[PDB]
Design an enzyme around this catalytic site. Structure first.
Site, PDB file in Angstrom:
ATOM      1  N   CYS B 106     -48.968  17.523  24.452  1.00 47.53           N
ATOM      2  CA  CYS B 106     -48.532  18.159  23.218  1.00 47.53           C
ATOM      3  C   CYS B 106     -49.151  19.525  23.043  1.00 47.53           C
ATOM      4  CB  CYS B 106     -48.900  17.291  21.986  1.00 47.53           C
ATOM      5  SG  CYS B 106     -48.240  17.985  20.451  1.00 47.53           S
ATOM      6  N   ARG B 109     -50.945  20.803  19.117  1.00 54.13           N
ATOM      7  CA  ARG B 109     -52.100  20.064  18.578  1.00 54.13           C
ATOM      8  C   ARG B 109     -53.049  20.877  17.697  1.00 54.13           C
ATOM      9  NH1 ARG B 109     -54.764  17.535  23.579  1.00 54.13           N
ATOM     10  NH2 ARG B 109     -53.351  18.891  24.846  1.00 54.13           N
ATOM     11  N   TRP B 278     -42.337  19.549  14.382  1.00 53.90           N
ATOM     12  CA  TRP B 278     -41.204  20.484  14.361  1.00 53.90           C
ATOM     13  C   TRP B 278     -41.028  21.073  15.775  1.00 53.90           C
ATOM     14  CZ3 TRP B 278     -45.493  21.570  10.998  1.00 53.90           C
ATOM     15  CH2 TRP B 278     -46.422  22.505  11.501  1.00 53.90           C
ATOM     16  N   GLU B 283     -37.358  23.690  23.649  1.00 49.85           N
ATOM     17  CA  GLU B 283     -37.005  22.281  23.787  1.00 49.85           C
ATOM     18  C   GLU B 283     -35.483  22.101  23.649  1.00 49.85           C
ATOM     19  OE1 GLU B 283     -39.900  19.275  22.045  1.00 49.85           O
ATOM     20  OE2 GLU B 283     -40.333  20.977  20.677  1.00 49.85           O
TER      21      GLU B 283
HETATM   22  C1  HEM Z   1     -46.318  20.126  14.454  1.00 51.21           C
HETATM   23  C2  HEM Z   1     -45.579  20.614  15.433  1.00 51.21           C
HETATM   24  C3  HEM Z   1     -45.541  20.031  16.869  1.00 51.21           C
HETATM   25  C4  HEM Z   1     -45.181  20.768  17.907  1.00 51.21           C
HETATM   26  C5  HEM Z   1     -44.766  22.270  17.842  1.00 51.21           C
HETATM   27  C6  HEM Z   1     -45.218  19.913  19.065  1.00 51.21           C
HETATM   28  C7  HEM Z   1     -44.906  20.284  20.338  1.00 51.21           C
HETATM   29  C8  HEM Z   1     -44.669  19.428  21.386  1.00 51.21           C
HETATM   30  C9  HEM Z   1     -43.918  19.717  22.594  1.00 51.21           C
HETATM   31  C10 HEM Z   1     -43.205  21.046  22.947  1.00 51.21           C
HETATM   32  C11 HEM Z   1     -43.956  18.624  23.366  1.00 51.21           C
HETATM   33  C12 HEM Z   1     -43.259  18.444  24.710  1.00 51.21           C
HETATM   34  C13 HEM Z   1     -42.011  17.666  24.295  1.00 51.21           C
HETATM   35  C14 HEM Z   1     -41.031  17.540  25.420  1.00 51.21           C
HETATM   36  O1  HEM Z   1     -41.047  18.390  26.367  1.00 51.21           O
HETATM   37  O2  HEM Z   1     -40.220  16.580  25.350  1.00 51.21           O
HETATM   38  C15 HEM Z   1     -44.721  17.603  22.695  1.00 51.21           C
HETATM   39  C16 HEM Z   1     -44.974  16.355  23.173  1.00 51.21           C
HETATM   40  C17 HEM Z   1     -45.707  15.389  22.522  1.00 51.21           C
HETATM   41  N1  HEM Z   1     -46.252  15.452  21.246  1.00 51.21           N
HETATM   42 FE1  HEM Z   1     -46.135  17.175  19.991  1.00 51.21          FE
HETATM   43  N2  HEM Z   1     -45.644  18.640  18.683  1.00 51.21           N
HETATM   44  C18 HEM Z   1     -45.850  18.679  17.321  1.00 51.21           C
HETATM   45  C19 HEM Z   1     -46.238  17.585  16.558  1.00 51.21           C
HETATM   46  C20 HEM Z   1     -46.690  16.372  17.079  1.00 51.21           C
HETATM   47  C21 HEM Z   1     -47.162  15.259  16.296  1.00 51.21           C
HETATM   48  C22 HEM Z   1     -47.178  15.279  14.738  1.00 51.21           C
HETATM   49  C23 HEM Z   1     -47.526  14.291  17.164  1.00 51.21           C
HETATM   50  C24 HEM Z   1     -48.096  12.886  16.860  1.00 51.21           C
HETATM   51  C25 HEM Z   1     -48.317  12.537  15.587  1.00 51.21           C
HETATM   52  C26 HEM Z   1     -47.304  14.755  18.520  1.00 51.21           C
HETATM   53  C27 HEM Z   1     -47.546  14.054  19.700  1.00 51.21           C
HETATM   54  C28 HEM Z   1     -46.927  14.284  20.931  1.00 51.21           C
HETATM   55  C29 HEM Z   1     -46.878  13.392  22.066  1.00 51.21           C
HETATM   56  C30 HEM Z   1     -47.489  11.964  22.210  1.00 51.21           C
HETATM   57  C31 HEM Z   1     -46.081  14.144  23.115  1.00 51.21           C
HETATM   58  C32 HEM Z   1     -45.673  13.660  24.512  1.00 51.21           C
HETATM   59  C33 HEM Z   1     -44.382  12.872  24.233  1.00 51.21           C
HETATM   60  C34 HEM Z   1     -43.796  12.490  25.559  1.00 51.21           C
HETATM   61  O3  HEM Z   1     -44.593  12.279  26.532  1.00 51.21           O
HETATM   62  O4  HEM Z   1     -42.543  12.452  25.624  1.00 51.21           O
HETATM   63  N3  HEM Z   1     -46.774  16.005  18.426  1.00 51.21           N
HETATM   64  N4  HEM Z   1     -45.131  18.127  21.488  1.00 51.21           N
HETATM   65  C1  LIG Z   2     -42.426  14.303  17.709  1.00 47.69           C
HETATM   66  C2  LIG Z   2     -43.801  14.876  18.069  1.00 47.69           C
HETATM   67  S1  LIG Z   2     -43.629  16.200  19.252  1.00 47.69           S
HETATM   68  C3  LIG Z   2     -42.526  17.268  18.351  1.00 47.69           C
HETATM   69  C4  LIG Z   2     -41.649  18.110  19.304  1.00 47.69           C
HETATM   70  N1  LIG Z   2     -41.622  19.365  19.076  1.00 47.69           N
HETATM   71  N2  LIG Z   2     -40.934  17.552  20.334  1.00 47.69           N
HETATM   72  C5  LIG Z   2     -40.792  16.103  20.545  1.00 47.69           C
HETATM   73  C6  LIG Z   2     -39.777  15.881  21.680  1.00 47.69           C
HETATM   74  C7  LIG Z   2     -38.389  16.414  21.295  1.00 47.69           C
HETATM   75  C8  LIG Z   2     -37.507  16.716  22.527  1.00 47.69           C
HETATM   76  N3  LIG Z   2     -38.164  17.623  23.467  1.00 47.69           N
HETATM   77  C9  LIG Z   2     -36.176  17.335  22.127  1.00 47.69           C
HETATM   78  O1  LIG Z   2     -35.907  18.479  22.563  1.00 47.69           O
HETATM   79  O2  LIG Z   2     -35.385  16.706  21.388  1.00 47.69           O
END
Ligand code: HEM
Ligand SMILES: CCSCC(=N)NCCC[C@H](N)C(=O)O
Ligand code: HEM
Ligand SMILES: C[C@H](O)[C@H](O)[C@H]1CNc2nc(N)[nH]c(=O)c2N1
Ligand SMILES: C[C@H](O)[C@H](O)[C@H]1CNc2nc(N)[nH]c(=O)c2N1
Ligand SMILES: CCSCC(=N)NCCC[C@H](N)C(=O)O
Ligand SMILES: [Zn+2]
Lengths: 411, 407
Positions: B106, B109, B278, B283
């Protein structure tokens, strides 16, 4: 054991057995992955197994494993090691070894070409002037007036580690960098330190933005000596853009021949500390990294300025927009001058084909995803979607410390 | 044992010590790196509880206090007697925030400590789950000014009574195999869509049909519910210079809400824990729109732009890619839906890494996922060495429920 890798675009699943032949370590453990870390005098006793493993590979490759010729060669090497503490490779074994180091180079995307490598045997070289002559010939052969051919030149192997051959340049052809008193840099900031060394050694610096560095060459552990590559041998490409006529006025050019000269080639436990090799460029190495890294020529601003993009907010993607135009320019320029270059689409697609062929014929293809994926447009290239396994096979190319850190100056 | 990471753009070197508290395994060995692989009892539970409570109590600066020792005592008694135990609200909130903090893939963070936790451990039915979820969706969406949130359903017991959201995200579009041979809508969701239809859903068979929720309570058979349309904020996609862009008929939803992962806190397993933040623009604009096995729109867009598509070396794919990503960001911004671009997001993550190194002794990070899928090396994360390791509390992948569920 069998290890599987999946392509998430195609669902093609491959099976790796080759990783079982891997001996060298990765840096990773069951508790930590160091996959993004850039960088993560032998005994008789350690040498014979290395020789043996290598010669078994060589003899298998030629379908002569366990032959009399194979066994005689093991005995001959064994006796040479015991009597002299080292051994000499036959020319055949050198060529095979150098091809295999390339084949095994997990960070190289150009490996479809591994079997077409011109090998120049420079093991009879004794002096820095001899090295200079060898390197001029390699540059002229490899350049081939723009129709680039892969080559390596192999200087004598390490003996006691006090008589090493080294090329001090990191690439045979690179541009000088000069730190100014006001803190700005003229030319290439990556080469500032090496440049200062050249100047200290007596090079007369032109002090421009694209000055081809002199070769700094060390034979037989002696202090290195400076040489100017004849300019007529240094093929260069002025950079222009197919639609933007103002692009030429940025004053950009680059050299056509990428030739890495600071790595160590290991074959059968022998160490070749001077082994410059060259192929041809993928467009992004120049248009993304050399031109657009903040720590390199850093031209993104000036280019986006001339394009009149909205530069007040990152979210207009002005940087991305200018980046694409610069890379089109590099490819357009090389093609227009008939200098070999490959785009990142073509290159990565060929690599996937190479990689699948390797799994089928060899049982695997070690590959470092962090390096293989291009530094622009990652996921629209097929390699982004390809799971890879990274492990270290020999023969190999290795990093080695910069020689100005270790050299004992004779004065 | 003490590890260094260098940034090759700035020469800044940081020392990681946090990795020594690493519990779980990476998939890598000394012989092989699997860095690019997508998926690499009473006795068990007490060490896990202890390890968590120790870090919780240390975090409120009460380590080795009578209140620390008392809670360890209490939880021990409860495990010995009930085979499981229950988190205090404070521990739950702490665990959830830390699961995010520890999420090595993520990039977002920097926000980790601003997370609204919705305790749904009192939920008993799928209808209850639906109510909880709509409230999460409405709260998080906040008319476009998005707020991070997680909703936490009851923990695993004997594992025959799991709560699960069957959807992979709360909000996603359906995918349909056509007689034609092609795929209508989102090909990533073809199988889940079929499961919905098989369970009863009336699909409108369009390109952008918001999927229904398929919710499983207490290990029961899952049920269908349609999220009120008025709670699903969507964005039509237009370009600030290309008037024709809108004719492509593209839209996306504002709320990214992952619903298929498992939250592990102090050895307790929360199999239904939808969470949302968000979007980073890439993405949607790079992956969702341009992946070949997704909406795959590059060919169409390039045609509209009148690019020479004869040869790869004209970089027509790259040119169109940028434009599509400009349009996504512009459309979200014009409608005031929170979105972050990859420049701003990666910059923030570098500042967060520095904070984490300074205040915590490190930050686990997966470079392969952190570096954006376009323009990699013009973002600072490209040049930043990262160490990847697994800390707990964590978010984990888990098998898709249809492969496991017995009806
Ligand atoms: C607040 C804005 C946030 C942004 C901008 C963000 C951004 C991202 C991005 C770009 C990814 C890669 C997603 C992908 O390529 O499919 C990701 C993955 C992830 N995020 Fe965040 N995130 C946010 C909030 C959160 C929150 C609130 C949580 C948990 C409460 C979280 C937990 C995770 C986890 C566990 C992954 C890996 C998911 C996977 O392996 O498919 N994120 N995040
Ligand atoms: C929900 C916690 S991480 C928030 C986020 N920014 N991405 C989550 C993965 C979404 C996916 N890559 C999509 O393009 O629909
Ligand atoms: C023939 C065309 C070739 C192409 C298109 C190609 C492409 C590339 C690229 C793009 C890189 C990464 C460069 C960087 O980011 O600095 C690379 C690395 C590398 N290549 Fe190739 N290469 C070619 C030929 C060769 C040859 C002839 C050899 C040796 C015989 C070789 C061995 C290596 C090695 C050892 C690396 C890693 C270098 C490092 O770690 O700095 N390549 N190649
Ligand atoms: C920290 C990170 O590993 C480093 O910036 C790497 C990433 N990938 C790379 N990939 C290539 N081809 N060349 C590079 O110099 C780098 N740099
Ligand atoms: C095989 C490879 O690991 C895979 O394509 C990864 C690469 N990096 C990624 N990065 C992010 N953020 N999301 C992804 O889905 C992926 N996919
Ligand atoms: C020499 C064998 S590999 C051939 C190659 N394509 N890359 C060499 C590295 C060049 C560096 N990236 C530069 O941009 O000058
Ligand atoms: Zn690893």
């Amino acid at each position: 054991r069998f290890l599987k890798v999946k392509n998430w675009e195609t669902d093609v699943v491959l099976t790796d057995t080759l990783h079982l032949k891997s001996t060298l370590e990765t840096g990773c453990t069951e508790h930590i992955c160091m996959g993004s870390i850039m960088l993560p005098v032998r005994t008789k006793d350690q040498l014979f197994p290395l020789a043996k493993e290598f010669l078994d590979q060589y003899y298998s490759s030629i379908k002569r494993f366990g032959s009399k010729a194979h066994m005689d060669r093991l005995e001959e090497v064994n006796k040479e090691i015991e009597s002299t503490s080292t051994y000499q490779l036959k020319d055949t074994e050198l060529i095979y070894g150098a091809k295999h180091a390339w084949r095994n180079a997990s960070r190289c995307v150009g490996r479809i070409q591994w079997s077409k490598l011109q090998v120049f045997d420079a093991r009879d070289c004794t002096t820095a002037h001899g090295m200079f002559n060898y390197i001029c010939n390699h540059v002229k052969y490899a350049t081939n007036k723009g129709n680039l051919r892969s080559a390596i030149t192999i200087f004598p192997q390490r003996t006691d580690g006090k008589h090493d051959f080294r090329v001090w340049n990191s690439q045979l052809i690179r541009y000088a960098g000069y730190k100014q008193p006001d803190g700005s840099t003229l030319g290439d900031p990556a080469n500032v330190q090496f440049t200062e060394i050249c100047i200290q050694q007596g090079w007369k610096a032109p002090r421009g933005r694209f000055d081809v560095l002199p070769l700094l060459l060390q034979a037989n552990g002696n202090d290195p000596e400076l040489f100017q590559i004849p300019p007529e041998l240094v093929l260069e490409v002025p950079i222009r853009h197919p639609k933007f006529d103002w692009f030429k006025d940025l004053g950009l050019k680059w050299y056509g021949l990428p030739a890495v000269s600071n790595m160590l080639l290991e074959i059968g436990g022998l160490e070749f500390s001077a082994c410059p090799f060259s192929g041809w460029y993928m467009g992004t190495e120049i248009g993304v990294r050399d031109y657009c890294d903040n720590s390199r020529y850093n031209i993104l601003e000036e280019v986006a300025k001339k394009m009149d993009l909205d530069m007040r907010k990152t979210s207009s993607l002005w940087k991305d927009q200018a980046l694409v135009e610069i890379n089109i320019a590099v490819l357009y320029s090389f093609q227009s001058d008939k200098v070999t270059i490959v785009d990142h689409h073509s290159a990565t697609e060929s690599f996937i084909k190479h990689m699948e062929n390797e799994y089928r014929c060899r049982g695997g293809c070690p590959a470092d995803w962090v390096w293989i994926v291009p530094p622009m447009s990652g996921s629209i290239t097929p390699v982004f979607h390809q799971e890879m396994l990274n492990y270290r096979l020999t023969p190999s190319f290795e990093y080695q410390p910069d020689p100005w850190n270790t050299h004992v100056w004779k004065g």
